[PDB]
Design a binder for this molecule. Sequence first.
Ligand SMILES: [Ca+2]
Ligand SMILES: [Ca+2]
Ligand SMILES: [Ca+2]
Ligand SMILES: [Ca+2]
Ligand SMILES: [Ca+2]
Ligand SMILES: [Ca+2]
Lengths: 197, 202
Amino acid sequence: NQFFLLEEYTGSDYQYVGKLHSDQDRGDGSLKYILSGDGAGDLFIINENTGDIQATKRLDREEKPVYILVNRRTGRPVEPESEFIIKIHDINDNEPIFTKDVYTATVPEMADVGTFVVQVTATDADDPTYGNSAKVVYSILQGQPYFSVESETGIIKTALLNMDRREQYQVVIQAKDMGGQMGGLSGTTTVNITLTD
Amino acid sequence: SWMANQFFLLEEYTGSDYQYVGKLHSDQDRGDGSLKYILSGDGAGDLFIINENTGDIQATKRLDREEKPVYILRAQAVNRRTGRPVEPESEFIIKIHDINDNEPIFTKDVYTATVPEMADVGTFVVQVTATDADDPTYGNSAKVVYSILQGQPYFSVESETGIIKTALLNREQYQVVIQAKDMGGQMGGLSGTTTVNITLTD
Ligand SMILES: [Ca+2]
Ligand SMILES: [Ca+2]
Ligand SMILES: [Ca+2]
Ligand SMILES: [Ca+2]
Ligand SMILES: [Ca+2]
Ligand SMILES: [Ca+2]
């Protein structure tokens, strides 16, 4: 089977992970299931009779993504040393974060349109491999008209022909989750551009 | 016996691929081809597609939890050769996982309210309320945070309850706009506003 479990559970009762149902299981009370791992007794808790496993705390995926997982009368082991995947599933709950709070850049005065100024980057602590939670899109908030930024790549280019020293510009770039669709989390950075003479 | 796997998918999937939902499976299966899995119920056959050989369920459409949060389907497992069940036909649930795609909406659009003129600081005026269609079970996509956008020095709002209070110690009408926003303490998310009129008694 597969044992996922949604992160950041906000409620007050235990979280059902799933049950270990052996093909060796007879049907009656012939067997009992045993815990195997770190947290397996307080964090994860097992129903001895059935193999039902439940979690006991609210879990943050970003803090730990993955977890490592006999007869009632005799105790004779009919199963091998167990190990399953308890991978905490992902929700979008981390803001995109730029790699630098202030990017300092310069661009030649007599510059053609599309002239590279500086490239900005935002990491995203969420799962880039499930949903759009970490698909970040870059947009310009201040400095607009004079400069452009590539939605996907975060490359800032000059977007104006007639540009001579106003020597200085302050550009604000937004990064946003969910391929930029409304509802996504966002971060900003400021870019100080001086025109080189 | 049916293996008690879970069945889910994210809402509002923006990819031309079909989403994997889960695997129906039983003890009696032998990785053999001897079993035929059958899927019936609301959606089966067009909304939800099953591999009869492995028991893999896929979803075809982009779904919306706020429209419909859980689906009840029926699972069967029959012998190919004999045509007989190896498992009893059972209902099972497909859960639709949430994305933050609903704004907090205030109960009223205009909250007309009143409070005495000579009132002390922190005198309760009115409690505004916003609700959020998203899922309160996981994260903050549906936990709203109240904040004041207009009505400064004059008035205050309680962050988690939406109670408006007098913020002064010393005009008759006051236009106060309260904002509600999910994903508190985080930039982004979704927000809603409301106008609250305050007239002082004289
Ligand atoms: Ca988290
Ligand atoms: Ca994110
Ligand atoms: Ca996360
Ligand atoms: Ca929705
Ligand atoms: Ca939603
Ligand atoms: Ca929401």
